[PDB]
């Protein structure tokens, strides 16, 4: 869907923590602020945004 | 969901083609025959099965 | 070009050795026997063939 | 050669875009400004520079 | 040391399971039967052997 | 152990150089200043710190 979730998240062991995510084809989630893709068809995209929290796992699988 | 789809697929340039896929947490799709995971909680899994076709992209994103 | 070379090669510490390679867009080298690509435009390909020798580095860079 | 090209490029979905590239043994292209390699022989290098455009694919393969 | 351990292990969800491991510079563990390295100095090696069990984590870190 | 070493190091071809490292389960070395891990059990961690030198290879293997 367009709603924000994340399956693989990583955080730094600092306080507050700094965390990020994974891969989608053509577009990133609606909440993403800087999105990076491959110059190809279909393009494989990732979110580069960093927060002090992780989104919840994608509810499907 | 439990239904079979695939976002990143790769095939050999032979006839018939030999193709495979990507990553899920704890479990693989219902149609998967040999599934491999990391000894960790939560475990990150992948399907090793090979077909002569690709499933369609996950309908959500 | 169409000529066979390899930049990143890996071999098993057995006798005779078993060795393979890396990445190209749309097509593999002319000598490649089983070539695998991504269902996308432009497709990113790799050779899965195994020999008991490595090709020489690509002469360009 | 020494001339600047790129096979795998990625860009952020922002305006202007922010883009980067891939892998070479011992040295990066002549136009590269910050180049990073592995402490090994032969060393495997990558360019970390970021532009608002992508170079064209390497003309050979 | 020369003793056999493994930090990152992966297994198939079949019975009995089929499992493997990770990365070392110049040589693999003493128990490894097919070891694969990069044609470079120092070479980065991995074990390709498959068992129906995982070794224990490296005791150091 | 808790002592600082590094097996895979990479540096930029600038003066002074800017260098970093690799992977551990649950914790980073004692000298690490910003450490990033996966939200999972056991978590896989990496050091993001950058210096103008590389640590020496882990003395064990």
Token representation of residue C14: 């057995």
Under an 8 A CB cutoff, do E44 and D40 touch? yes
* Chain A neighbors of D50, CB-CB under 8 A: none
Report the b/e string of A12-45 with b at 16+ CB within 10 A. Answer: bbeeebebbbebbbeebbeebeebbbbebeebbb
Chain E, nearest residue to D43 by Cα = E40
Residues constituting chain C: 61
C-alpha F45/C-alpha D21 separation (Å) is 25
- In the DSSP assignment, the letter for residue D27 is -
Sheet of D35-38, strand order:
D23-25, D44-47, D35-38, F10-12, F19-20
Token representation of residue D45: 């290098």
H or E stretch at E10: strand E10-12
Q: Does chain D touch chain E (at least 3 C-beta pairs within 8 Å)?
A: yes
Token representation of residue C42: 């432009």
Indicate the resolution in Å. 2.5
Domain ranges of chain B: 1-61
H or E stretch at A5: none
Neighbouring chains of E at 3+ CB pairs within 8 Å? B, C, D, F
CA distance D44 to chain F (A): 9
DSSP tally for chain C: helices H, then strands E: 0, 5
Residue pair E56/E30 in contact (Cβ under 8 Å)? The answer is: no
Nearest by CB: F54 against D35, D39, D46: D39
Question: Concatenated DSSP letters for E20-52?
Answer: E--EEES---TT-SSEEEESSBS-EEEE---BS
Report the b/e string of C2-38 with b at 16+ CB within 10 A. Answer: eebbbbbbbbbbeeebebbbebbbeebbeebeebbbb
> By the CB < 8 Å criterion, does D22 face chain A?
no
Residue pair C19/C51 in contact (Cβ under 8 Å)? The answer is: yes
Question: Concatenated DSSP letters for B14-39?
Answer: SSS--EE--EEES---TT-SSEEEES
Token representation of residue A25: 């084809």
Choose the CATH number for A1-61 among 1.10.510.10, 3.40.47.10, 2.10.69.10, 3.20.20.140. Answer: 2.10.69.10
* Chain B neighbors of C28, CB-CB under 8 A: 13
Report the b/e string of F3-30 with b at 16+ CB within 10 A. Answer: ebbbbbbbbbbeeebebbbebbbeebbe
Under an 8 A CB cutoff, do E35 and C12 touch? yes
> By the CB < 8 Å criterion, does C26 face chain B?
no
SS3 category, F20: strand
**What residues contact residue E14 under an 8 Å CB cut-off, 6+ apart?**
B34, B35
Residue pair D8/C45 in contact (Cβ under 8 Å)? The answer is: no
* Chain E neighbors of C12, CB-CB under 8 A: 34-36, 48
* Chain B neighbors of F42, CB-CB under 8 A: 40-41
Q: In angstroms, how far is the first alpha carbon of chain C from the final one?
A: 13
| Triad D60, C41, D15: Cα angle to 5° | 95
- In the DSSP assignment, the letter for residue D30 is T
Burial class (CB in 10 A: 0-12, 13-18, 19+), B50: middle
What technique was this entry resolved by?
Answer: X-ray
C-alpha C59/C-alpha D21 separation (Å) is 20
Under an 8 A CB cutoff, do E23 and F1 touch? no
Give residue A47's Cα distance to chain centre: 4
Q: Does chain B touch chain C (at least 3 C-beta pairs within 8 Å)?
A: yes
C-alpha C18/C-alpha C52 separation (Å) is 5
Nearest by CB: A28 against D10, D13, D54: D13
> By the CB < 8 Å criterion, does C44 face chain A?
yes
Nearest by CB: D60 against C1, C8, C23: C1
Sheet of B44-47, strand order:
B23-25, B44-47, B35-38, E10-12, E19-20
H or E stretch at B44: strand B44-47
Sheet of E44-47, strand order:
C19-20, C10-12, E35-38, E44-47, E23-25
* Chain A neighbors of D11, CB-CB under 8 A: 36-37, 39
| Triad F41, F47, F50: Cα angle to 5° | 170
Question: Concatenated DSSP letters for A23-59?
Answer: EEES---TT-SSEEEESSBS-EEEE---BSSPPPPPS
SS3 category, B51: strand
Comparing C-alpha atoms, which of E30, C15, E25 is closest to residue F7? E25
- The residues facing A11 across adjacent strands are A19, F37
């Amino acid at each position: 869907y367009s709603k924000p979730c994340c399956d693989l998240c990583m955080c730094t062991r600092s306080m507050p923590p700094q965390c990020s995510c994974e891969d989608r084809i053509n577009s990133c989630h609606s909440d993403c602020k800087s999105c990076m893709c491959t110059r190809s068809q279909p393009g494989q995209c990732r979110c580069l945004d960093t927060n002090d929290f992780c989104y919840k796992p994608c509810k499907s699988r």
